[PDB]
Amino acid sequence: VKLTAELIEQAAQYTNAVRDRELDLRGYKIPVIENLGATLDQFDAIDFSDNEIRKLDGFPLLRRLKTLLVNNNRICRIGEGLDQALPCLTELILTNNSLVELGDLDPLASLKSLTYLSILRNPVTNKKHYRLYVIYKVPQVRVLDFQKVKLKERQEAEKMFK
């Protein structure tokens, strides 16, 4: 059950709780996120929860994409061309994923508009100084794992590994 144009044209699309145009693509078990050109950047949020996506890549240019729900998936790697395809990506929910190393968070630093990031329920969050490395690598993010970044955490991230 791969993501095609007929699956995106038959999927439900409505208004979310934040008054944004969201398309519900849950319950599809798509192994790879592709063929997203049929939406023509008419959705403000993408609900791709409960899927089997392994890599968050292969997305076309969508300037209206501001929220991406990748919860309950097996995402273990992030694409390096995420900034060239989503310049206005501000919300990224990557809870309960397959990220084990902090080096997968290195392509996530290119998103300058990203402010809300969720990396909870992951083996990469259980490593030593994971939050300090995420604050040092991504200074544009203001809320990490439902927690506001303070000045002391930014000073601790800028002190170590400088």
Partner: protein, 166 residues
């Protein structure tokens, strides 16, 4: 308190904005299921509290059980069931196959037993301190037997559900 599709979380940080807290609650509730509505106020009566109403009651129950006492913006929020039904849900609404129930309350009618069995999909019939519930599907009957084993309904007594014999 009976389980419902709306789960109310309280004891949260009231210093954040309303839209940011609503977006954080929606991003927290999207991992357990589709969030239909999010009611969040910042007045003197509803300070530091919000609620999320979902489509399915099982996703709301899983979000209330998993995020019970989770730290939200520095303060551990307490999640519980809603007292009344939501307006959006009221607007949108309007192993073996046989399972043996023991220690059931006699004051409960057939409508309460149907609402308790409605977490599982459509069954064949219901029989009425002992009761017999037979489902049309074997996996649905197994999920209903695994879910109702020690359920929180009429807390003066404890309800026990077991599989029927031949």
């Amino acid at each position: 308190i009976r389980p419902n599709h709306t789960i109310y979380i309280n004891n949260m940080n009231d210093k954040i904005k309303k839209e940011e807290l609503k977006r954080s609650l929606y991003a927290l509730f999207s991992q357990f299921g589709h969030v239909v509505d999010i009611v969040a106020l910042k007045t003197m009566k509803m300070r530091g509290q919000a609620f999320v109403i979902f489509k399915e009651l099982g996703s709301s129950t899983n979000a209330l059980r998993q995020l019970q006492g989770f730290p939200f913006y520095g303060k551990p929020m307490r999640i519980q069931y809603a007292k009344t039904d939501s307006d959006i849900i009221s607007k949108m609404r309007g192993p073996n196959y046989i399972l043996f129930l023991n220690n059931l309350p006699e004051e409960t009618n057939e409508m309460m037993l149907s609402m308790l069995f409605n977490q599982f999909p459509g069954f064949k019939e219901v029989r009425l301190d002992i009761a017999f519930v037979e489902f049309e599907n074997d996996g649905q009957a197994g999920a209903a037997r695994d879910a109702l084993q020690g359920f929180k309904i009429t807390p003066s007594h404890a309800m026990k559900i077991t599989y029927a014999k031949k």
